[PDB]
């Protein structure tokens, strides 16, 4: 009956595959339809919208690939007498401020990410580096403010902890992914032969991922390096592997509510004319390091080792 749309920008992590189950669960749930489709590009994203309209739906949740595109999105949108609820990545307008009006459900970024600088400092004391002969790198991807908030976050734990401000280094990356972090990375490492450990900095499980294998690939050891991620989903296989490698952990955050959450609440504000609060924060965070991955996943119905 009801056609509801779910549309993401990256459906290879699986951090938007969760986001996706979970909606299904909740069309089951309530009596509607999820559409999903995956909106990897601007162009993509507003022919899908065109797409919805054909097959007749009455709104769409979307994490948009660059929330630039948010003006379009919601003009196409009204165009077609859906409702839109954003997911993670908040909309701006061309000036880059927030588009405030348009619904968002998203993780509490900046406490994530200084919880990350937390856990990185902590196991950097359990292990006992000698602080002269590390340095952190910070991976970022200050033109989207939920990776922005969540670098910046971390790198203000670091230093609100006492690490030396001067020893912490930035470097941008081209596309939120392994490879692109790989590269920027790679190009950092070869700047700094001083350093013997590193603490990886960056916004998600991907990001950590490229800058751990990056390290492999100028010989370092996985007790020199401690890379913690955010998504959690997204680093089973490499917390699964036989070896301990560079990836320390990642910090869960909760996927399945804001699948459910931005899915329910679309349904009662097309079906009840129920108004959606305009900021939903999650703050649920959980460690899971390769000690106790399986039972935290268990523990959150995200079942499967
Ligand atoms: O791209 C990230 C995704 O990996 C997840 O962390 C949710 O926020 C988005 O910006």
Not at 59 to 78: M, N
Not at 85 to 106: R, W
Not at 152 to 173: C, H, N, R, W
Not at 238 to 259: C, I, M, N, R
Request: charged share 25%; glycine share 10%; proline share 5%.
């Amino acid at each position: 009956n009801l056609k509801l749309g779910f549309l993401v920008k990256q459906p290879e992590e699986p951090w938007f595959q969760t986001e996706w189950k979970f909606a299904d669960k909740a069309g089951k749930d309530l009596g509607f339809e999820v559409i999903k489709i995956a909106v990897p590009d601007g162009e993509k994203t507003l022919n899908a919208i065109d797409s919805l309209a054909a097959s007749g739906a009455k709104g769409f949740v979307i994490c948009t690939p660059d929330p630039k595109l948010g003006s379009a999105i919601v003009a196409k949108a009204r165009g077609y007498d859906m409702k839109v609820i954003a997911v993670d990545d908040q909309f701006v307008n061309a000036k880059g401020k927030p588009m405030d009006t348009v619904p968002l459900v998203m993780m509490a970024a900046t406490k994530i990410g200084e919880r990350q600088g937390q856990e990185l400092y902590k196991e950097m004391q359990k292990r006992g580096w000698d602080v002269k002969e590390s340095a952190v790198m910070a991976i970022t991807a200050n033109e989207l403010d939920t990776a922005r908030r969540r670098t910046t976050g971390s790198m203000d734990a670091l230093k609100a902890a006492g690490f030396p401000e001067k020893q912490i280094y930035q470097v941008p990356t081209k596309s939120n992914d392994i490879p692109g972090a790989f590269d920027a990375a790679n190009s950092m490492l070869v700047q700094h032969p001083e350093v013997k450990h590193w603490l990886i900095v960056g916004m998600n499980d991907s990001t950590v991922l490229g800058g751990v294998r990056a390290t492999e690939g100028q010989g370092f050891k996985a007790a020199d390096i401690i890379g913690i991620g955010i998504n959690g989903v997204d680093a089973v296989s490499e917390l699964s592997k036989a070896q301990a490698t560079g990836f320390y952990g990642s910090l869960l955050p909760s996927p399945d509510v804001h699948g459910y959450k931005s899915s329910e609440m679309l349904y009662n504000w097309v079906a009840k004319d129920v108004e959606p609060p305009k900021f939903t924060e999650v703050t649920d965070v959980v460690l899971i390091t390769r000690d106790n991955f399986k039972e935290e996943l268990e523990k959150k119905g995200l079942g499967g080792k």
